[PDB]
């Protein structure tokens, strides 16, 4: 695909003869590969010099007439304001015609850096293409000897031009997804809606409830949290794009190819059917010979095979990007950290239930599950797997904290700043004390120690420090709120990107309620309180917790683009 | 909505200042209404003269350079052909660039012809709007004395210019619906699919089959037939639009607003969801107190209220367009006939099973249904309603033939041509003899007359008469096939529109096959053969006749657009 034929796709035909004719210069690139060698390798560098001057002459002429039009647009605007200083109703209609003229020139300006960047990207593609076609390194230097020094690239006046246009718009003045991809979202949004209703009815009416269903819920709870996250992240990618925050830049995402919000809802929908089908099948058990415990591996196994597929199909381009990011996060100290590394490494800190539930499924299927009985997923009637023996659950529980804490220490040894790179380590180091004091208390109660209640105090004394540490932190720097430049935006930062100010006030209240209760759940599961209360409270809070991470994703990215608090891009 | 802002909506901004500025004159009109009288009328007969000359000067100049560009393209294309007469690879690449050049030139011709016709429409809207705002007839007189004689309207050279453009393209050279509608279509499709599978499973397993279920099928068949027809008609409109057939013209539809295929798919999906819900509810009967027979009334009454709703919401425009067409069709002799009337009155001829089932439902609910028992839709265990007593079934069966015969007679009386306006009369009149002889056979067999088998031979003899009459007719004039000007397209007409001829051959075979069984289906319903065989053969043949009607609709429109066989537009 080579960026070759898709280059001219996002180019207006009015400049068709003017842009780099990438499709043309490939054709005789393969001519010599099918058909002197030094002459054939130099002619392209002279051919690219033909395109060098063609874009050099046009851009400078366009740039010169753009800044001259910047005088003209200036001459246009305040004169309308001077005209402002039915007659005025036509005048602002004439202004709105001028706002169109400013917008078309802004659109005309928009085309100009594309005439630079698309060409600027268009060059390098044909120079490395020449670089393995003829096995040369001069092309890698030709972009340095010509492109990196060419007038159409070195002069960045076009970048600062729209910077004035955007400013003057805010001072004086003030592609859709393919139809098939939109349809498939509806089809997968409909099969998921009805299938849930039959699941509700099947549990209440058909399936019997005398047998304990606790193992079934604690096994299938892992799947639901992932499906909630992917769908909730689909709303996020729509919010960023609509608001205006350039998530394509902060994420260091591929500038050309990216997943729109419609694409995310399709992956969320498809897994929704498979999860619902597996749960519904386990109830009725239509096969009557295939055991019920084989269905959970079919569901989780399918997702794993979906993610790690070599086949260059089914979102293959975007699947490796996650795989590269996931591995770089897990081996945190061995690599540097960017915004992509930080984001995923933190997202796993609110998805800790899935990692825990993986341990339960592994233990249950290997210690307490009988592979000689058809219905084994539902017990006939006290299992180590759902307990905290040896604190194996505590070790996996602290895994998400380990990834971030190591990253912050690694992020300290490249810049040597105690603030805000070591204070961040404090907020992640508190969760280690959260689980340790919990596990020791529960074991002491089981043994019967007199000072068991002493360990209860620390687990409650250390309960609060964890909550306020991450609450005062998320509300001050991650979101950037509570600033001295509040002005009109009282208790807020000076500039807001999202339309309505009530949303910022709404999330401040919500980020406190769901934070003081979440730290109970991450520590309740270690201790033993009640078999019903050991699930009924962990199943009503875990789907709530991922919602908190969803709203926190709305403001961290905005505060990373407005102020660059993270200093990732400098 | 007055065509006012949507005029400028489908106008390229490059000519925005050149088109009529409908919004400004609307505003001055409401300024008048909010605030001399003749002096008002007089000064806006010159105001439209301002746009009269503005568009007169632009169009004639644009057409003057267009025909000069027509000389230019005639200086361009054969020069490429002369250049045609890797070198030739670059030559034909420049040839394709010149085809692109002719493409935006044709786009500019498109811009010119709408700069004529949309401007023409805007004139008539503003003049008529002035005709009730100030209660004057001069505006219509002005649209006759200036618009109807204007240089930009009287000179139709642009139409033949685009004709020449299409001719040269065929000689030498050779908007998407909003995403919400597509998503809704997908949602309804998925819900329908899952509910159908649930219905099949419930029928096979849960509901008991010892009791007779024939009344349920003979009641619920009509909704399925209607839904199938609507979905197939959506596919029909998609095929028409994609092929190039200008169905906007033959149907005399509104040039601006029309129902694209996805709207039809949405309506079909919604009705399918409702029908499936009604059937599934009738199966389980969850309420256990509400009787099972009220669900068909709920479904059919909801459909009726949907079609007759006064509210100007939910496809209101198309809704009353269909209502007007149906009213004009049913009172056939009192009105003239256009393509819409003929098309709907013929569509109703292949949907007779819906009327038959409506009659059956009326009789069953008025004569044999006990309104004092909850479960009555399923008989406990010989019903006059499902029989053919008095030939009420016969008369409702021949109703559509009566409508079409009356329409053809009215067309003949308004034209006085024995061909082709009287052979159609016999083709539609054979059905009366069909049903009369079938009913007489059945009655005589019930009585036990010796010459009942005489009526058997008479029915069988008239069977082939009815079958070949409409089969030869549909294959010769309605489709236009089997023409002497075959040439390469053997057994076909000289010009074909759809891409592949195998479609034509398959449709010929399909029509010949299915025309000999729909007649059996429409003739058995009067006679009595077997309670199982009565229902089964009709139930497996009814959903096929609508498919045959769809495939006939696929070709009748092409034939009338290509040859004007019906002579409706002359
Ligand atoms: C007891 C049984 C219960 C069973 C429950 C099972 C769960 C049901 C969940 C239903 C999921 C529905 C979500 C699908 C929405 C798809 C919308 C869509 O595709 O529209 C995209 C929309 C328009 O895009 P446009 O601007 O035209 O073009 C964009 C350029 N690419 O642009 C947008 O992206 C904006 C509008 C869409 C995003 C905002 C709203 C989406 C979600 C709203 C709430 C859905 C309900 C959530 C679950 C219930 C909890 C409240
Ligand atoms: C092992 C523990 C697992 C626990 C959960 C951790 C994983 C959670 C899910 C993955 C992370 C969330 C998605 C992050 C992406 C959000 C960023 C965004 O908006 O961009 C979309 C991203 C960019 O892709 P794009 O720009 O097209 O490609 C760049 C290179 N050309 O493109 C993307 O959408 C990237 C994400 C991959 C594509 C969608 C996800 C596919 C995976 C399905 C489920 C995997 C199940 C894992 C096993 C679970 C076992 C219980
Ligand atoms: C990857 C996992 C492996 C594959 C999983 C396969 C799909 C999930 C399981 C589907 C099972 C559907 C029900 C099977 C019925 C088997 C019999 C049964 O238990 O029936 C329950 C109920 C009462 O039946 P009863 O009279 O007791 O039967 C006596 C037997 N002679 O009789 C009924 O069935 C009552 C009606 C309720 C049925 C609801 C079924 C809805 C969902 C089924 C699949 C739909 C798929 C939709 C998506 C596909 C793509 C569009
Ligand atoms: C016991 C179990 C029973 C299970 C079965 C129950 C019934 C299931 C019926 C499912 C019906 C689904 C049909 C919905 C199709 C909608 C597609 C759509 O909207 O796509 C639009 C498509 C592309 O549009 P584009 O050209 O991009 O833009 C047009 C500009 N306005 O434009 C188009 O319209 C062109 C492409 C789509 C139209 C042609 C193909 C549609 C139908 C294909 C066959 C469907 C199956 C029929 C039922 C089975 C019998 C074979
Ligand atoms: C009483 C006996 C009934 C037996 C069956 C007879 C009715 C069959 C269904 C209606 C007729 C078929 C539809 C014809 C449309 C095909 C023409 C076409 O492609 O154009 C769509 C047409 C034009 O609309 P448009 O151009 O937008 O508006 C013009 C004015 N601006 O716009 C249309 O789509 C017009 C049709 C209306 C909109 C869809 C239909 C709504 C009705 C729903 C179901 C009706 C149930 C009737 C009762 C049944 C009782 C058993
Ligand atoms: C226009 C009419 C107005 C609308 C009418 C109502 C909606 C349509 C009918 C829906 C009926 C759903 C099921 C009703 C169950 C009623 C009870 C019953 O008989 O259940 C059957 C079976 C046996 O039940 P049993 O255990 O004997 O009950 C003992 C009571 N304690 O037990 C079972 O239920 C077995 C489990 C299978 C149930 C399958 C249901 C699938 C479809 C349900 C509706 C789907 C939603 C549609 C779309 C929603 C919106 C998008
Ligand atoms: O779509 P992708 O998988 O990303 O591959 C394309 C393209 O692949 P094709 O050779 O099959 O067309 C190649 O473009 P060229 O460099 O050969 O011109 C090259 O990838 P491969 O050589 O490995 O096939 C290139 O780089 P990359 O895959 O790293 O992205 C990339 O084009 P883009 O860089 O524009 O995406
Ligand atoms: O949306 P529609 O139903 O098509 O009605 C609009 C518009 O209605 P409104 O007055 O409510 O905006 C009127 O436009 P004017 O002719 O008054 O400028 C007029 O309909 P009514 O006067 O009956 O309301 C006109 O005619 P029609 O409804 O017959 O189509 C039609 O605008 P268009 O003719 O451009 O479609
Ligand atoms: C989340 C990532 C790290 C993977 C999941 C955690 C893995 C490493 C955990 C989860 C369940 C764990 C097992 C659970 C129970 C037992 C029984 C006992 O003999 C100790 C080891 C053994 C066999 C554990 C080995 C490690 C294990 C497989
Ligand atoms: C996280 C994803 C990969 C899901 C994990 C599924 C796989 C890795 C797990 C789930 C259940 C596991 C099995 C559970 C029990 C036993 C019996 C033991 O005597 C040998 C290992 C064996 C056979 C395990 C092998 C690994 C296994 C199949
Ligand atoms: C940098 C430092 C502070 C990080 C420490 C993280 C690791 C080493 C800590 C965090 C949680 C801890 C566990 C928490 C609870 C228990 C249960 C107890 O019966 C034995 C020790 C054991 C199993 C702990 C072992 C050490 C542990 C895994
Ligand atoms: C339940 C209460 C206490 C807290 C819940 C807060 C929820 C409802 C609020 C907090 C932040 C909000 C978002 C803030 C900004 C945007 C962008 C806007 O263009 C569409 C709405 C959207 C996407 C909002 C959706 C609703 C939202 C998620
Ligand atoms: C298709 C259009 C014309 C409407 C449907 C046909 C109507 C007119 C038909 C269908 C069912 C018919 C009824 C069926 C049975 C009987 C019983 C007997 O006492 C004769 C009249 C009566 C009561 C009929 C009256 C006319 C009727 C209501
Ligand atoms: C064509 C569409 C509207 C479907 C027809 C539904 C309506 C018109 C029909 C269906 C069943 C019918 C009812 C069937 C039986 C009776 C009992 C009789 O003593 C009085 C009339 C009455 C009460 C009928 C009135 C009309 C009725 C409600
Ligand atoms: C112009 C002419 C040819 C059209 C004739 C159409 C009408 C009048 C015809 C067509 C179908 C006919 C009916 C068909 C069957 C029977 C059953 C029989 O036991 C009595 C007569 C009766 C009820 C017929 C009466 C007349 C009828 C209604
Ligand atoms: C069953 C056999 C004997 C006959 C069935 C005929 C069917 C399959 C054929 C007959 C005519 C065909 C159509 C002819 C033309 C068009 C338009 C084209 O752009 C897409 C295919 C489409 C929409 C075809 C769909 C399939 C079709 C309806
Ligand atoms: C579960 C039944 C579904 C039946 C309908 C399936 C409709 C989608 C078919 C897609 C085929 C391939 C086209 C993909 C186009 C694209 O990549 O956008
Ligand atoms: C059964 C659950 C459905 C929930 C999701 C419903 C999504 C559709 C909402 C429609 C709102 C109106 C939007 C109309 C816009 C348009 O006309 O294109």
Short mmCIF file of N, CA and C in Angstrom, two decimals, chain A residues 385-487:
data_model
loop_
_atom_site.label_atom_id
_atom_site.label_comp_id
_atom_site.label_asym_id
_atom_site.label_seq_id
_atom_site.Cartn_x
_atom_site.Cartn_y
_atom_site.Cartn_z
N UNK A 385 -9.03 -21.83 46.07
CA UNK A 385 -8.84 -20.96 44.92
C UNK A 385 -9.48 -19.59 45.12
N UNK A 386 -10.68 -19.54 45.71
CA UNK A 386 -11.31 -18.26 45.98
C UNK A 386 -10.92 -17.69 47.34
N UNK A 387 -10.05 -18.36 48.07
CA UNK A 387 -9.51 -17.84 49.32
C UNK A 387 -8.21 -17.09 49.04
N UNK A 388 -7.46 -16.78 50.10
CA UNK A 388 -6.23 -16.00 50.02
C UNK A 388 -5.04 -16.77 50.57
N UNK A 389 -5.05 -18.10 50.43
CA UNK A 389 -4.01 -18.92 51.03
C UNK A 389 -2.64 -18.55 50.48
N UNK A 390 -1.68 -18.37 51.40
CA UNK A 390 -0.30 -17.98 51.10
C UNK A 390 -0.27 -16.57 50.50
N UNK A 391 -1.44 -15.94 50.39
CA UNK A 391 -1.52 -14.62 49.80
C UNK A 391 -1.14 -14.57 48.34
N UNK A 392 -1.43 -15.63 47.58
CA UNK A 392 -1.17 -15.60 46.14
C UNK A 392 -2.00 -14.51 45.48
N UNK A 393 -3.23 -14.31 45.95
CA UNK A 393 -4.06 -13.24 45.43
C UNK A 393 -3.45 -11.88 45.70
N UNK A 394 -2.77 -11.72 46.84
CA UNK A 394 -2.12 -10.45 47.16
C UNK A 394 -0.99 -10.14 46.18
N UNK A 395 -0.24 -11.16 45.76
CA UNK A 395 0.90 -10.94 44.88
C UNK A 395 0.43 -10.45 43.51
N UNK A 396 -0.56 -11.14 42.93
CA UNK A 396 -1.07 -10.72 41.63
C UNK A 396 -1.79 -9.38 41.75
N UNK A 397 -2.46 -9.14 42.88
CA UNK A 397 -3.16 -7.87 43.08
C UNK A 397 -2.21 -6.68 42.96
N UNK A 398 -1.00 -6.81 43.47
CA UNK A 398 -0.05 -5.71 43.46
C UNK A 398 0.70 -5.59 42.14
N UNK A 399 0.44 -6.47 41.17
CA UNK A 399 1.15 -6.40 39.89
C UNK A 399 0.92 -5.07 39.18
N UNK A 400 -0.31 -4.56 39.03
CA UNK A 400 -0.47 -3.26 38.35
C UNK A 400 0.27 -2.12 39.04
N UNK A 401 0.36 -2.14 40.37
CA UNK A 401 1.12 -1.11 41.07
C UNK A 401 2.61 -1.23 40.78
N UNK A 402 3.10 -2.45 40.63
CA UNK A 402 4.53 -2.66 40.36
C UNK A 402 4.94 -2.05 39.03
N UNK A 403 4.11 -2.20 38.00
CA UNK A 403 4.47 -1.69 36.68
C UNK A 403 4.61 -0.18 36.69
N UNK A 404 3.70 0.53 37.35
CA UNK A 404 3.76 1.98 37.36
C UNK A 404 4.88 2.48 38.27
N UNK A 405 5.04 1.86 39.45
CA UNK A 405 6.06 2.32 40.39
C UNK A 405 7.45 2.16 39.81
N UNK A 406 7.71 1.04 39.13
CA UNK A 406 9.00 0.85 38.48
C UNK A 406 9.20 1.87 37.37
N UNK A 407 8.14 2.17 36.62
CA UNK A 407 8.24 3.16 35.55
C UNK A 407 8.63 4.52 36.09
N UNK A 408 8.03 4.94 37.20
CA UNK A 408 8.34 6.24 37.77
C UNK A 408 9.79 6.31 38.24
N UNK A 409 10.27 5.26 38.89
CA UNK A 409 11.68 5.22 39.27
C UNK A 409 12.58 5.23 38.04
N UNK A 410 12.21 4.48 37.01
CA UNK A 410 12.94 4.55 35.75
C UNK A 410 12.82 5.93 35.13
N UNK A 411 11.65 6.56 35.24
CA UNK A 411 11.48 7.92 34.76
C UNK A 411 12.26 8.94 35.59
N UNK A 412 12.77 8.54 36.75
CA UNK A 412 13.55 9.45 37.58
C UNK A 412 15.02 9.44 37.17
N UNK A 413 15.54 8.31 36.71
CA UNK A 413 16.96 8.14 36.46
C UNK A 413 17.39 8.64 35.08
N UNK A 414 16.49 9.29 34.34
CA UNK A 414 16.86 9.94 33.09
C UNK A 414 16.78 11.46 33.17
N UNK A 415 16.05 12.01 34.14
CA UNK A 415 15.97 13.46 34.32
C UNK A 415 16.37 13.93 35.71
N UNK A 416 16.41 13.04 36.71
CA UNK A 416 16.87 13.37 38.06
C UNK A 416 16.09 14.55 38.65
N UNK A 417 14.76 14.45 38.60
CA UNK A 417 13.87 15.43 39.20
C UNK A 417 13.03 14.75 40.27
N UNK A 418 13.15 15.22 41.51
CA UNK A 418 12.34 14.68 42.59
C UNK A 418 10.87 15.09 42.49
N UNK A 419 10.56 16.10 41.67
CA UNK A 419 9.20 16.56 41.49
C UNK A 419 9.05 16.89 40.01
N UNK A 420 7.99 16.41 39.35
CA UNK A 420 6.94 15.53 39.86
C UNK A 420 7.16 14.08 39.47
N UNK A 421 8.40 13.58 39.54
CA UNK A 421 8.69 12.22 39.12
C UNK A 421 8.91 11.26 40.29
N UNK A 422 9.28 11.77 41.46
CA UNK A 422 9.37 10.94 42.66
C UNK A 422 8.13 11.02 43.53
N UNK A 423 7.43 12.16 43.54
CA UNK A 423 6.17 12.25 44.26
C UNK A 423 5.15 11.30 43.64
N UNK A 424 5.22 11.11 42.32
CA UNK A 424 4.36 10.13 41.67
C UNK A 424 4.61 8.73 42.21
N UNK A 425 5.87 8.40 42.50
CA UNK A 425 6.19 7.09 43.06
C UNK A 425 5.53 6.89 44.41
N UNK A 426 5.33 7.96 45.18
CA UNK A 426 4.66 7.83 46.46
C UNK A 426 3.22 7.39 46.33
N UNK A 427 2.52 7.89 45.31
CA UNK A 427 1.11 7.57 45.16
C UNK A 427 0.90 6.12 44.74
N UNK A 428 1.87 5.54 44.03
CA UNK A 428 1.79 4.14 43.62
C UNK A 428 2.38 3.18 44.65
N UNK A 429 3.26 3.65 45.52
CA UNK A 429 3.85 2.80 46.54
C UNK A 429 2.92 2.53 47.71
N UNK A 430 1.83 3.29 47.82
CA UNK A 430 0.93 3.13 48.96
C UNK A 430 0.08 1.86 48.83
N UNK A 431 -0.12 1.37 47.61
CA UNK A 431 -0.97 0.20 47.42
C UNK A 431 -0.28 -1.07 47.92
N UNK A 432 1.05 -1.07 47.95
CA UNK A 432 1.77 -2.20 48.52
C UNK A 432 1.42 -2.37 49.99
N UNK A 433 1.38 -1.27 50.74
CA UNK A 433 1.01 -1.35 52.15
C UNK A 433 -0.47 -1.67 52.32
N UNK A 434 -1.28 -1.34 51.31
CA UNK A 434 -2.72 -1.60 51.37
C UNK A 434 -3.01 -3.09 51.49
N UNK A 435 -2.34 -3.91 50.68
CA UNK A 435 -2.66 -5.34 50.63
C UNK A 435 -1.93 -6.10 51.72
N UNK A 436 -0.69 -5.71 52.03
CA UNK A 436 0.09 -6.43 53.03
C UNK A 436 -0.61 -6.42 54.39
N UNK A 437 -1.06 -5.25 54.83
CA UNK A 437 -1.72 -5.16 56.13
C UNK A 437 -3.06 -5.88 56.11
N UNK A 438 -3.69 -5.98 54.94
CA UNK A 438 -4.93 -6.73 54.83
C UNK A 438 -4.71 -8.23 54.97
N UNK A 439 -3.71 -8.77 54.27
CA UNK A 439 -3.47 -10.20 54.30
C UNK A 439 -3.05 -10.67 55.69
N UNK A 440 -2.19 -9.91 56.36
CA UNK A 440 -1.73 -10.31 57.69
C UNK A 440 -2.87 -10.30 58.70
N UNK A 441 -3.79 -9.33 58.60
CA UNK A 441 -4.91 -9.28 59.52
C UNK A 441 -5.79 -10.52 59.39
N UNK A 442 -6.16 -10.88 58.16
CA UNK A 442 -7.08 -11.99 57.96
C UNK A 442 -6.47 -13.30 58.45
N UNK A 443 -5.19 -13.53 58.16
CA UNK A 443 -4.53 -14.74 58.63
C UNK A 443 -4.48 -14.78 60.16
N UNK A 444 -4.20 -13.63 60.78
CA UNK A 444 -4.14 -13.57 62.24
C UNK A 444 -5.50 -13.88 62.85
N UNK A 445 -6.58 -13.39 62.23
CA UNK A 445 -7.92 -13.72 62.72
C UNK A 445 -8.19 -15.21 62.61
N UNK A 446 -7.76 -15.83 61.51
CA UNK A 446 -7.95 -17.27 61.35
C UNK A 446 -7.18 -18.05 62.42
N UNK A 447 -5.94 -17.65 62.70
CA UNK A 447 -5.17 -18.31 63.74
C UNK A 447 -5.74 -18.03 65.12
N UNK A 448 -6.19 -16.80 65.37
CA UNK A 448 -6.71 -16.42 66.66
C UNK A 448 -5.79 -15.56 67.50
N UNK A 449 -4.95 -14.74 66.88
CA UNK A 449 -3.99 -13.94 67.64
C UNK A 449 -4.71 -12.83 68.41
N UNK A 450 -4.19 -12.52 69.60
CA UNK A 450 -4.77 -11.45 70.41
C UNK A 450 -4.62 -10.09 69.74
N UNK A 451 -3.46 -9.84 69.12
CA UNK A 451 -3.20 -8.59 68.43
C UNK A 451 -3.71 -8.58 67.00
N UNK A 452 -4.68 -9.43 66.68
CA UNK A 452 -5.27 -9.41 65.34
C UNK A 452 -5.94 -8.07 65.07
N UNK A 453 -6.67 -7.54 66.05
CA UNK A 453 -7.31 -6.24 65.89
C UNK A 453 -6.30 -5.12 65.71
N UNK A 454 -5.05 -5.31 66.16
CA UNK A 454 -4.02 -4.31 65.92
C UNK A 454 -3.75 -4.17 64.43
N UNK A 455 -3.61 -5.30 63.73
CA UNK A 455 -3.43 -5.27 62.29
C UNK A 455 -4.64 -4.70 61.57
N UNK A 456 -5.83 -4.82 62.16
CA UNK A 456 -7.01 -4.18 61.58
C UNK A 456 -6.86 -2.66 61.58
N UNK A 457 -6.26 -2.11 62.64
CA UNK A 457 -6.09 -0.66 62.73
C UNK A 457 -5.22 -0.14 61.60
N UNK A 458 -4.05 -0.75 61.40
CA UNK A 458 -3.15 -0.29 60.34
C UNK A 458 -3.81 -0.41 58.97
N UNK A 459 -4.51 -1.51 58.72
CA UNK A 459 -5.22 -1.66 57.46
C UNK A 459 -6.30 -0.60 57.29
N UNK A 460 -6.82 -0.06 58.38
CA UNK A 460 -7.74 1.07 58.29
C UNK A 460 -7.00 2.40 58.36
N UNK A 461 -5.94 2.49 59.16
CA UNK A 461 -5.11 3.69 59.17
C UNK A 461 -4.43 3.88 57.82
N UNK A 462 -3.93 2.80 57.22
CA UNK A 462 -3.34 2.90 55.90
C UNK A 462 -4.37 2.90 54.79
N UNK A 463 -5.64 2.60 55.11
CA UNK A 463 -6.72 2.72 54.13
C UNK A 463 -6.87 4.15 53.65
N UNK A 464 -6.84 5.11 54.59
CA UNK A 464 -7.16 6.49 54.25
C UNK A 464 -6.02 7.16 53.51
N UNK A 465 -4.77 6.89 53.91
CA UNK A 465 -3.64 7.58 53.27
C UNK A 465 -3.58 7.22 51.80
N UNK A 466 -3.94 5.99 51.46
CA UNK A 466 -3.98 5.61 50.05
C UNK A 466 -5.04 6.39 49.30
N UNK A 467 -6.21 6.58 49.91
CA UNK A 467 -7.31 7.24 49.23
C UNK A 467 -6.99 8.70 48.95
N UNK A 468 -6.58 9.45 49.98
CA UNK A 468 -6.32 10.87 49.80
C UNK A 468 -5.09 11.12 48.94
N UNK A 469 -4.08 10.25 49.05
CA UNK A 469 -2.88 10.42 48.24
C UNK A 469 -3.21 10.43 46.75
N UNK A 470 -3.98 9.45 46.29
CA UNK A 470 -4.37 9.39 44.89
C UNK A 470 -5.55 10.28 44.56
N UNK A 471 -6.31 10.74 45.55
CA UNK A 471 -7.41 11.66 45.28
C UNK A 471 -6.91 13.09 45.15
N UNK A 472 -6.07 13.54 46.08
CA UNK A 472 -5.46 14.86 45.94
C UNK A 472 -4.56 14.92 44.72
N UNK A 473 -3.96 13.79 44.33
CA UNK A 473 -3.07 13.77 43.18
C UNK A 473 -3.83 13.85 41.86
N UNK A 474 -4.84 12.99 41.68
CA UNK A 474 -5.59 12.98 40.43
C UNK A 474 -6.34 14.28 40.21
N UNK A 475 -6.70 14.97 41.29
CA UNK A 475 -7.50 16.18 41.21
C UNK A 475 -6.66 17.45 41.08
N UNK A 476 -5.34 17.34 41.14
CA UNK A 476 -4.46 18.51 41.12
C UNK A 476 -3.58 18.58 39.89
N UNK A 477 -2.94 17.48 39.51
CA UNK A 477 -2.01 17.47 38.39
C UNK A 477 -2.47 16.64 37.20
N UNK A 478 -3.05 15.46 37.44
CA UNK A 478 -3.56 14.66 36.33
C UNK A 478 -4.67 15.40 35.59
N UNK A 479 -5.55 16.07 36.32
CA UNK A 479 -6.59 16.88 35.71
C UNK A 479 -6.26 18.36 35.69
N UNK A 480 -5.37 18.82 36.56
CA UNK A 480 -4.96 20.21 36.55
C UNK A 480 -5.93 21.18 37.20
N UNK A 481 -6.92 20.69 37.93
CA UNK A 481 -7.92 21.54 38.54
C UNK A 481 -7.37 22.21 39.80
N UNK A 482 -8.20 23.04 40.43
CA UNK A 482 -7.84 23.77 41.65
C UNK A 482 -6.60 24.63 41.43
N UNK A 483 -6.73 25.59 40.53
CA UNK A 483 -5.62 26.44 40.12
C UNK A 483 -5.91 27.89 40.50
N UNK A 484 -4.84 28.65 40.70
CA UNK A 484 -4.92 30.04 41.12
C UNK A 484 -5.37 30.97 40.00
N UNK A 485 -5.39 30.51 38.75
CA UNK A 485 -5.87 31.29 37.62
C UNK A 485 -7.33 30.99 37.31
N UNK A 486 -8.13 30.69 38.33
CA UNK A 486 -9.52 30.28 38.11
C UNK A 486 -10.31 31.37 37.40
N UNK A 487 -10.28 32.59 37.94
CA UNK A 487 -11.03 33.69 37.36
C UNK A 487 -12.52 33.39 37.26
#
